[PDB]
Design a binder for this molecule. Structure first.
Ligand SMILES: *[C@@H]1O[C@H](CO)[C@@H](O[C@@H]2O[C@H](CO)[C@@H](O[C@@H]3O[C@H](CO[C@H]4O[C@H](CO)[C@@H](O)[C@H](O)[C@@H]4O)[C@@H](O)[C@H](O[C@H]4O[C@H](CO)[C@@H](O)[C@H](O)[C@@H]4O)[C@@H]3O)[C@H](O)[C@H]2NC(C)=O)[C@H](O)[C@H]1NC(C)=O
Ligand SMILES: *[C@@H]1O[C@H](CO)[C@@H](O[C@@H]2O[C@H](CO)[C@@H](O)[C@H](O)[C@H]2NC(C)=O)[C@H](O)[C@H]1NC(C)=O
Ligand SMILES: *[C@@H]1O[C@H](CO)[C@@H](O)[C@H](O)[C@H]1NC(C)=O
Ligand SMILES: *[C@@H]1O[C@H](CO)[C@@H](O)[C@H](O)[C@H]1NC(C)=O
Ligand SMILES: *[C@@H]1O[C@H](CO)[C@@H](O)[C@H](O)[C@H]1NC(C)=O
Ligand SMILES: *[C@@H]1O[C@H](CO)[C@@H](O)[C@H](O)[C@H]1NC(C)=O
Ligand SMILES: *[C@@H]1O[C@H](CO)[C@@H](O)[C@H](O)[C@H]1NC(C)=O
Length: 269
């Protein structure tokens, strides 16, 4: 279970919905995937050897995104889904673009990073709001079975992943905009000497620095909240959620910059 507050008991079972296990996909950084721009520097028409937090080429992505309709499986809130954070993670996220009255809506899975997920520890939450990427790191009272809902098409159950009636004390709270039209979003989340770092990019594969947050504590776990939504199924609309995650580590990369400063290719030495 995540956290320890009894938020609800409606429609909970222990069914192993994942008859097909966690889907897997092979990392391939030959086209810049998993790389990020270096500080404020600019490199032109050259190849650089750089050491940083990058995915291991040839490793596997894991599709941790989960979609439900009415029932939540207790198995969703344990290993292997609840995963260790270690140095960090690289995330490749599909932007599930739905339509209501021919109006576009952007949805994708929420991710929570923390150590114990209780109101005496800080938990980082990255939640999309249809073009607005809300990021907070707050002492949330995380539920056993946190989950988000699908604001455009609705859901059969109310949204609940924290129970704080009063506003919890916390360190960071900001909103970042992202292009709702793009099909893929990339994120780097890693920690170093008690400081949390975040990079992202909604256009192009290489990511750019978002923010850094001092925590003074070691993050140990991350989890992708299941999403329950009436739509997003082959019986109503051929759309699916995807949240690919792979571990990060300190590795040396060969980075090639084109004549305009865009990382076009990379190699994992
Ligand atoms: C920070 O986070 C912690 C958890 O990590 C929160 O602590 C929990 O707070 C909740 C809500 O106050 C507690 O739940 C309540 O516990 C009361 C005491 O439980 C005793 O009595 C019941 C019988 O009533 C026994 O079964 C039990 O074993 C204990 O002996 C209950 O009396 C409460 O019941 C009332 O509310 C529920 C809500 O669903 C109703 O269903 C009931 O009918 C009744 O009206 C309630 O269950 C919980 O015990 C706390 N856990 C711990 C470990 O402390 C903090 O509240 C939170 N603080 C902040 C500021 O966010
Ligand atoms: C960041 O974005 C969130 C989500 O849109 C904002 O939170 C909403 O703010 C409006 C207006 O104050 C409220 O009516 C909503 O109830 C809030 N929640 C949601 C889920 O929409 C938030 O105000 C924005 N700004 C900051 C600083 O967080
Ligand atoms: C959570 O609360 C509901 C409603 O009070 C109760 O029926 C259920 O048994 C509780 N769950 C646990 C694990 O105590
Ligand atoms: C880029 O570098 C290559 C190899 O040195 C060179 O042939 C080419 O003219 C350069 N182009 C620009 C625009 O710098
Ligand atoms: C959702 O919230 C509404 C408003 O409080 C309530 O009427 C309804 O019963 C709730 N349903 C569930 C499944 O929580
Ligand atoms: C948003 O993404 C679409 C599709 O990738 C692109 O055509 C458009 O120019 C982008 N707009 C902005 C402001 O990034
Ligand atoms: C989804 O695609 C399959 C295969 O093309 C098709 O049989 C099915 O009717 C589609 N469902 C919807 C809701 O479009």
């Amino acid at each position: 279970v995540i956290g320890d507050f009894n938020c609800t008991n409606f429609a909970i079972n222990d069914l192993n919905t994942t008859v097909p296990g966690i889907s897997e996909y092979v990392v391939d950084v030959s086209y810049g995937l998993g790389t990020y721009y270096i500080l404020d520097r600019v490199y032109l028409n050259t190849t650089i050897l750089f050491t940083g937090y990058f995915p291991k080429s040839g490793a596997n992505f894991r599709d941790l995104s989960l979609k439900g309709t009415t029932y939540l499986s207790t198995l969703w809130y344990q290993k292997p889904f609840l995963s260790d954070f270690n140095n960090g993670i690289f995330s490749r996220v599909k932007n599930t673009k739905l339509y209501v009255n021919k109006t576009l809506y952007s949805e994708f899975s929420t991710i929570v990073i923390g150590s114990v997920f209780i109101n005496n520890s800080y938990t980082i939450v990255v939640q999309p709001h249809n073009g607005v990427l809300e990021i907070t790191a707050c002492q949330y009272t995380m539920c056993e079975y946190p989950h988000t809902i699908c604001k455009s098409k609705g859901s059969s159950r109310n949204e609940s992943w924290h129970f704080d009636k009063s506003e919890p004390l916390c360190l960071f709270k900001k909103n970042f905009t992202y292009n709702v039209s793009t099909d893929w979003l990339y994120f780097h989340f890693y920690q170093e000497r008690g400081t949390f770092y975040a990079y992202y990019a909604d256009s192009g594969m290489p990511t750019t620095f978002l923010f850094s947050l001092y925590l003074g504590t070691l993050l140990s776990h991350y989890y992708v909240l299941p999403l329950t939504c009436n739509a997003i199924s082959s019986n109503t609309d051929n759309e699916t959620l995807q949240y690919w995650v792979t571990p990060l580590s300190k590795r040396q990369y060969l980075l090639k910059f084109d004549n305009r400063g865009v990382i076009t290719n990379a190699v994992d030495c």
